[PDB]
């Protein structure tokens, strides 16, 4: 399950990163 895990966790972390990026960049607008 080498390849399965590696290039499924790649897009897994894609989703995770976009998730946290938006959840960090919204309260920015709130206090702004």
């Amino acid at each position: 399950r080498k390849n399965r895990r590696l290039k499924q966790a790649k897009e897994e972390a894609q989703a995770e990163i976009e998730q946290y990026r938006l959840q960090r960049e919204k309260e920015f607008k709130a206090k702004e």
Partner: peptide, 24 residues
């Protein structure tokens, strides 16, 4: 199998959380 994606998530999560924190 497990370790591969384990440290994969670790590395990419860290190296992107650092960036987004610095930016914001």
């Amino acid at each position: 199998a497990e370790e591969e994606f384990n440290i994969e998530k670790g590395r990419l999560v860290q190296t992107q959380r650092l960036k987004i924190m610095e930016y914001y």
